[PDB]
Amino acid sequence: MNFPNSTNLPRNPSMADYEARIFTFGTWIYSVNKEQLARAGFYALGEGDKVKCFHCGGGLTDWKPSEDPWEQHAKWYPGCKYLLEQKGQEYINNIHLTHSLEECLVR
Ligand SMILES: COC[C@H]1C[NH2+][C@H](C)CN1CC(=O)N1CC(C)(C)c2cnc(Cl)cc21
Ligand SMILES: [Zn+2]
């Protein structure tokens, strides 16, 4: 499904600015907040609630009310350098431990 970009160089430079990302959404009806999405590096593709990160290229869909943009970014795209820059590895480990341990309690 395309490998995730793990370099310090964004895959989509045209979407590097917060403002550029914000425009891609338009009127947004979805449970997840467009400005929180833009902040977490995401821009809309115009395919329902599908977003992609400008940096890693990582795509995410089918946002539940309980699914946080930053947490999901870490969950599915842990190699993203934008994520590492913004949140730190301390945060990233926490999220990973949290989700890895969320699996324990469900089974
Ligand atoms: C459909 O999976 C579950 C949802 C649930 N809602 C959150 C926000 C995100 N979740 C992951 C996701 O959407 N994934 C993961 C992966 C890596 C399989 C992938 C690849 N491409 C695209 Cl477009 C999307 C996508
Ligand atoms: Zn990313």
Three-state secondary-structure class, residue 106:
helix
- What is the CATH number for 41? 1.10.1170.10
Output the known binding site.
Answer: 53, 56, 73, 80
* Strand partners of residue 51: 44, 60
Location of structure tokens 């301390």 = 90
Q: Based on the structure, what is the number of domains in the chain?
A: 1
Which protein residues touch ligand 1 with a CB less than 6 Å away?
Answer: 1, 50, 59-63, 67, 72, 76
Please state, in angstroms and rounded to a whole number, the distance separating the CA atoms of residues 34 and 51: 10
Structure obtained using: X-ray
Boundaries of domain holding 103: 1-107
State in Å: Cα 28 to ligand 1 middle. 19
User: Which amino acid is located at 6 in the chain?
Assistant: S
The answer to whether the CB of 35 falls within 8 A of the CB of 44 is: no
Q: Is-contact 74 67, C-beta < 8 A?
A: no
* CB under 5 Å of ion ligand 2: residues: 53, 55-56, 77, 80, 82
Q: Taking every pair of C-alpha atoms in the chain, what is the biggest distance, in angstroms?
A: 43
Closest CA to 68 of 14, 76, 90, 2: 76
User: How far is Cα 50 from Cα 17, in angstroms, rounded to an integer?
Assistant: 19
SS3 assignment for the chain: CCCCCCCCCCCCHHHCCHHHHHHCCCCCCCCCCHHHHHHCCEEECCCCCCEEECCCCCEECCCCCCCCHHHHHHHHCCCCHHHHHHHHHHHHHHHHHHHHHHHHHHC
User: Sign of dihedral through CA atoms 68, 83, 94, 79?
Assistant: positive
